[PDB]
Design a protein around this ligand. Sequence first.
Ligand SMILES: Nc1ncnc2c1ncn2[C@@H]1O[C@H](COP(=O)(O)OP(=O)(O)NP(=O)(O)O)[C@@H](O)[C@H]1O
Ligand SMILES: Nc1ncnc2c1ncn2[C@@H]1O[C@H](COP(=O)(O)OP(=O)(O)NP(=O)(O)O)[C@@H](O)[C@H]1O
Lengths: 443, 443
Amino acid sequence: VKQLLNQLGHEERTKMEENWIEEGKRGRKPTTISPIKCAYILNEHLTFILFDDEENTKLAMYQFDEGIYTQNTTIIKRVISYLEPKHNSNKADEVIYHLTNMVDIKEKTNSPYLIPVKNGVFNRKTKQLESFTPDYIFTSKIDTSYVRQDIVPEINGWNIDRWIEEIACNDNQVVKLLWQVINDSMNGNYTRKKAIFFVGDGNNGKGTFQELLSNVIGYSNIASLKVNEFDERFKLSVLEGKTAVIGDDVPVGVYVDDSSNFKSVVTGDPVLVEFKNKPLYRATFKCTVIQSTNGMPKFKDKTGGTLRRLLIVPFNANFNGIKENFKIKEDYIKNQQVLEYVLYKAINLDFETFDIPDASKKMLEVFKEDNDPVYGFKVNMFDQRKVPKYIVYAFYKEYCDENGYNALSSNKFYKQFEHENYWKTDAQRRNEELARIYNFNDN
Amino acid sequence: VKQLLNQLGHEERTKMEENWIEEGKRGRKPTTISPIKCAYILNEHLTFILFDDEENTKLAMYQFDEGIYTQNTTIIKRVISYLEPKHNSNKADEVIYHLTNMVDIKEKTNSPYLIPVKNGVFNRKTKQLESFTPDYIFTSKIDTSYVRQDIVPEINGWNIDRWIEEIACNDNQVVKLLWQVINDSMNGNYTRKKAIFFVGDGNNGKGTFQELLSNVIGYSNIASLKVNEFDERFKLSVLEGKTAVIGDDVPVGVYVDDSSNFKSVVTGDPVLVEFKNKPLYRATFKCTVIQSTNGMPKFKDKTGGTLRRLLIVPFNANFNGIKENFKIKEDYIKNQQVLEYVLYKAINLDFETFDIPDASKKMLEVFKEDNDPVYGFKVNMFDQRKVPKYIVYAFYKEYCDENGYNALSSNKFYKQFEHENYWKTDAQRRNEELARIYNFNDN
Ligand SMILES: Nc1ncnc2c1ncn2[C@@H]1O[C@H](COP(=O)(O)OP(=O)(O)NP(=O)(O)O)[C@@H](O)[C@H]1O
Ligand SMILES: Nc1ncnc2c1ncn2[C@@H]1O[C@H](COP(=O)(O)OP(=O)(O)NP(=O)(O)O)[C@@H](O)[C@H]1O
């Protein structure tokens, strides 16, 4: 590209001089290509597009070697210097401005079936790799190269697939889910309407797995934001061009006062996002949610909407008793051969809905008991009754022995919402005892 | 208009060159049309207007293909480049300033009887489609095309009307209300002084209906604001150019402290709005309010205005039990034929006041009982008594089993304000018992 523009610039400069020689020394000497002329040359011999007609849209250039469109002005301005090095920043801006008016408007290819990779675009419908073309409008791509892998790479006798088995404590469902998680992470146009949480007390490898995703996927392609930080001002601004969002560390049992922004991103509904000192606008994020926490956080919603969105990974394995291998976190996951195999296996994996492991379901039920004290009381009933409201209330087994405040007769309406027998009214059965109380089961 | 402007610019440049030849080589050579001449040519051969005479008003250009006036400076500057490509940003701004000085001032057509649609304007008085003309000043239009529909479109054997029936659990009143809600949503100049709230326990399809509305209407034409976010600073600024506002998710039972701006927007009264780092100004919003919540929120007003402004949609249907059809939310509602049929049926529907379903009336009454403890106690009275204030008080049936703080006698004044028998004072009937108390009904 640089060699092409350098030849074009010299040819155009020579042509201008020849015309000036033909007209004689009228004034000074034309040695600098005019900014409008530069736009004419660049548009002809390069691919400049405009993403949309909205005001102050930045010009996008298709850099041939990378195969993706870029809006970086410095990259574009460097290209201007190849054609006309004598242009300063103001004149280069004039060249950019002229190109903005000239170029046609094309929208970014947001097809979920296409995933850009360093080697080229990957079409999930055909499960085939396609070479970079200007027709595919992409602004970012996965850093790792896509090559066909037949044998699992081994570095110092360490197997990446066995490491995944070690992380999941040799659980077939979890390792299947973990591969599905990596598959969903790379695709930035399909969200699958699920949120992934990593729960580990300590040294469970959550950070290494996050660093693995940060390595197989581009470093710039990932976002760092916690669950409680989604609703803060300007925090959603970072998720503009991110394929996925990773929560490096979530506070233990943090109270998510408002999960509306979190729930919208997980489902994929449009959310209100504002850049700092910039006007508020509306956009849709399809990136998946990855969060690492040392314990399931508490959500104020206590509704079915939050429950369906959440997915939990057990991470039962501990690396404290076993000797810590800093080589895994620092070197092994950064190996190119290891990364390429992970990319090849994950992107080739095809699935429609997240295959929920039984361990996640059991641990998800634990969170439901923790989140809703009423549901925990229903689970912990273990009783063979409906007519006496005070008996079935029983102060909810003394706060269900959890020290969580419970309303009076309001959660009772919420209780029957949770649950065949429903409500039966009998005057005989329905204040024998105030009930603190050790009568776990009556007659 | 690109061809016309190119020809005009070439002709003007040729005329200037001929004039310079007539005057000889006085100095250099005139090849760039002066900005004032460009403004003259554009005003002669295009339609530029100014919405109002207030300071720093942006010039509006009638783009012929779209049929609506636009204030986007990039489009106008692209038009300038079509006329004279060699102007940079500064000279384009000079042309825009000259045009602003030249053009006349016309106000936007805010007639509620006219609804701009992609094909053309729709007159509700005549219920007829009219082609685009510069006479109608519109800044935005409905994205979907208006075509006459005779048969309900079917994609993969899925019927949109049957989907609406399924959403409303085969309730004629609720589906009629939904069609009326869509009809109100399309019109951005008539507010009808009602607020629509979607309540759903689980997967009730509220998000799918919101996406359907955002698809039939223009994506840029909808605002994303929740109720509790109405009074947050700079949040109303987005509402200026939106036909309707939709809250994607509302926290379950969120305590909306201040509802003044929300009530004003629902009624349509003028409200004070401020953009970030921009002067405060008073503006009138006629957009309709649609909100999705997993439970009816609470308002501190306990006033008739909040009750009369609010309208609730049951959404009793649940898609958690029936297998979820992701194609409904992802693909089927994005079908052009389905969107066109929905547009036609909704815009052709004619009604004056929101036909409130009986289910909404019962659910609205349940919200009224929840909002005011005194009203709920009065409903739960079921008693055959007026003279003893403490007896009829009964601590409001001991908080009415809803742990709501109640005034000792101010709420009594509020009760007698709400409610034939009124008050009768008798010394005989009026401290037998302190009254906690199980005497539900006395003699
Ligand atoms: N298979 C393995 N065997 C032994 N040590 C390992 C293995 N995989 C990773 N490690 C080490 O275990 C540590 C994992 O750190 P990390 O994942 O951050 O712990 P964590 O507390 O669970 N995550 P975080 O809460 O963000 O700190 C690193 O020192 C790794 O080098
Ligand atoms: N008729 C239908 N039959 C089955 N599934 C449906 C039907 N209509 C929609 N769905 C699916 O049901 C889901 C609707 O999601 P959504 O409307 O967001 O649930 P919601 O909780 O009520 N709204 P929200 O609170 O914002 O999440 C999507 O997965 C749709 O594909």
